[PDB]
Each structure stands twice: as C-alpha cells, then as structure tokens.
Amino acid sequence: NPTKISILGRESIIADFGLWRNYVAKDLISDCSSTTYVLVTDTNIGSIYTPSFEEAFRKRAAEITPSPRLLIYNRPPGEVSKSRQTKADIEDWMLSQNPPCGRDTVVIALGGGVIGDLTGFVASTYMRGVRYVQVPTTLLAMVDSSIGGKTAIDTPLGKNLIGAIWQPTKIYIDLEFLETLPVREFINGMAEVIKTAAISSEEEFTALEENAETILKAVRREVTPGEHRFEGTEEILKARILASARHKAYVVSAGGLRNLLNWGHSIGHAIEAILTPQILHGECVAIGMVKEAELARHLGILKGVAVSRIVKCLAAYGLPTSLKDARIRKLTAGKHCSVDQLMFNMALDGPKKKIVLLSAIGTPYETRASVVANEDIRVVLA
C-alpha cells in the first residue's frame, strides 16, 4: 500500500496516509543508516508534528547499538527563514553539537516550499554535501516543490537566486498532512495538479472534473473529532494527487517536457510578481493557465470548449479564473495589473515570448514552449 514512485533511477517518492507516524522514523534508520538525523521545520509545523515523531524515533532507534541521535531545529515561520542568515544559523547550529554533525548526517525537511528549499540547500553545501529527505506538509510541496531537487534561498534582489540542484534521498508524501492543511493552501496546491493533468492526460483532467465537488466538499467539511477528513474518498484523493506528482517525477527523470511544466506560469509569474504576497502562487498560476489557454484559442490552436473546461475545472476547485475575482480584489485592496506591467514582468524572465500552448486538453501544441508575438499576448491581458 505504500505507493512508491521512482525518479531518476531509484524510487525516492513514498506516498501514503500516516507515513509520518508509522513509517518515516523506521525507514530512515533502515534505508538511510546514520548516527545523526537533523530535522528542520518552523515552530508552528513543529509544535504540531515534531512531538509524535520524536517518539516514533527512539522507538525504532532503540533497536540499534549504538542508537542514532535526533537533533531538532525550529526556524521561524514564513518565507522569512528562507535566507542566507537562517541557512547559516542552521549550519553553525549543526556544526556546534557535540559531536559535530558529520557527513553521515541525514537532514529532514518537514514543511512546505519554504522549508523544503532552505533545508534542501543547507544539506547540499553542508560539508560539501550530505543526504537529506523531504516530508512536504503542503499540497503544493507534495506534488511540485519537493520533487525535482531544486533548492535555494531568497535575497533582497529576488527569489531563489542562490542555490543548488541536490536530489533528496527520500520524499515522504504523507497525504495525512492535508487533513489539517488550511483550506486556502489546499485549493492553492490543486492549481499545479490540474496544470499537470491538462498537459498530459485528458482522462486525468476528466477525473479531476468529476471528483471536484467531492474533494472540495471534504476539504471544506466540518470534521468530527476522531474522524478522517477524507473518509470515503481516500483512494480518489490519493489517485488525483499522486497522478500529478508522478508526472512531475517523470519529467524530472527526462528540455521538452520540463518546459511544459511552465504552462500557465509565463503569465502566471507576471501576475504573481504583482499580487504576491497577498495572492499565492497556485492562485496566480490558475489565472495564468486561463489566459494562456485563451491565447491558444486566439491563435486558433485551442478550441473554445476546451478553454471553458479549464475555467470551469479551476473554479470547481475554488481557484480564481480572473483578476476580477472578488477574493483577489479584496485581498489586494485594488492592486491592478496593467498590460504594460504584466508584459514587463514577462520579459523580466525580448521581442517575443515563449508561452506553453495547448491544442487540446491533455495535448500540448509543440513538445516545447511555443514562440508567440507580443501584440498577440497583449490581447489576453485585462
């Protein structure tokens, strides 16, 4: 039942409900032998999950002589802790324990994008490289963030500017984290999930359209204490989620496909650079996919009915589909993205623009990002 997915050779992705409680601690010891296991997380995420883990650790760690140790570090929440100085606070922290954390260390990244990127990057340079595993707590991190080996930190001049490609030895996808993942954060992650489906399998996109109501009903429902948020749809949820992560993994193992993973992001990033941090990545990318789908329709590449499904499906999962979206409006206080600013932020990444184009749901136009004229792009921005 512990669904395993491979990436770049061996299977590092292990997805199932309850891994954090009954499988992680044990697996680390048996597959990631070491004397030191360093866990990184933010105070909030750690005050909730770290406790049950410390216990699951000694349990399975005591059957060994000498017994390995567990050192824990709680960084402040927010994308604040994703900086040159926190990376340093951690490094110096590990280097200070007695005995100092050596090269056998195994770093645990318990958290979302912020925790994953920072933690992943720390291990990549700690004594020129040490093993580490990923335990994404957020949906977005589960299907996109954790997978790929991309790690980095942010600077006053921009996001993810300093970092390295360091693959995680393991990627534990505990779908039980979703049971308590703030609603908004869930809807947020579903943007990439839908993104993946729409660029690879019209049948998977269809299953998303079908399960939308159900999944979203569970996500929003008032869960009675002692009951599992996703009772009855465990398999549905599992399927729809792992399907996205599985595709991400397949692209990583393979610049054609990878480029297709930026569908909606061309315009999405332009939107996000303006609306962040009030509006989240997934939310922007949702609007981004919509616009980029309209462009394909504009070039006569994509058919309208397809554009409708993208929009309907995205909305069915609580995602916004236009900058006119009220929620957005209220959250940004009237922050307005102009066609000029949008076009400016897109070229911030020349005379043309490389936009991922779809000819049909689940079927890309080219096996790469297409080249589209600016004037044609300035038509789908408003």
Nearer to its own copies by Cβ, of 148 and 189: the residue is: 148
Distance of CA 341 to the CA centre of its chain: 26
Q: What residues are labeled active site?
A: 269
The Cα 13–Cα 248 span in angstroms is 11
Per CB under 8 A, the list member of 41, 105, 124, 266 interacting with its own copies is 124
Query: Which of 31-39, 68-76, 118-126, 181-189 is the region at the interface with its own copies (rule: CB under 8 A)?
Result: 118-126
Taking the complex as a whole, how short is the minimal distance between the CB of residue 109 and its own copies, in angstroms?
17
Per CB under 8 A, the list member of 48, 62, 64, 95 interacting with its own copies is 95
The Cα 126–Cα 105 span in angstroms is 9
Q: At what angle do helices 183-198 and 234-253 cross, to 10 degrees?
A: 50
Structure tokens at 252: 């990583």
Q: Binding to its own copies by residue 103, rule CB under 8 A?
A: no
Known binding residue 121? Answer is no
Half-sphere exposure of 249 (CA within 13 A, CB side): 24
Q: Binding to its own copies by residue 100, rule CB under 8 A?
A: yes
Binding to its own copies (CB under 8 A) within 140-199 occurs at 150-152, 155-158, 160-165
Known binding residue 4? Answer is no
Structure tokens at 19: 């891994």
Known binding residue 81? Answer is yes
Query: Which of 59-67, 126-134, 180-188, 307-315 is the region at the interface with its own copies (rule: CB under 8 A)?
Result: 126-134
CA angle 379, 381, 382 (to 5 degrees): 110
Known binding residue 22? Answer is no
Structure tokens at 274: 């303006």
Nearer to its own copies by Cβ, of 46 and 120: the residue is: 120
Spatial CA neighbour of 12 closest among 133, 112, 152: 133
Breaks in the chain, after residue numbers (C to N greater than 2.5 Å): 254, 349
Q: Binding to its own copies by residue 252, rule CB under 8 A?
A: no
Binding to its own copies (CB under 8 A) within 301-340 occurs at none
CA angle 142, 317, 235 (to 5 degrees): 55
Helix (H, G, I), strand (E, B) or coil at 382: coil
Nearer to its own copies by Cβ, of 125 and 374: the residue is: 125
Nearer to its own copies by Cβ, of 148 and 288: the residue is: 148
The Cα 28–Cα 359 span in angstroms is 44
Contact between 93 and 73 under an 8 Å Cβ cutoff? The reply is yes
Per CB under 8 A, the list member of 48, 88, 373, 382 interacting with its own copies is 88
Q: Binding to its own copies by residue 126, rule CB under 8 A?
A: yes
Q: Which DSSP symbol is given to 380?
A: S
Known binding residue 208? Answer is no
The residues that bridge with 11 in the sheet, in sequence order, are 6
Count of residues that bind its own copies according to CB under 8 A = 26
Per CB under 8 A, residues contacting its own copies are 84, 88, 91-92, 95-96, 100, 124-129, 150-152, 155-158, 160-165
Annotated binding site: 42-44, 79-82, 112-114, 117, 128, 137-138, 144, 150, 159-160, 177-180, 188, 192-195, 248, 258-262, 265, 281
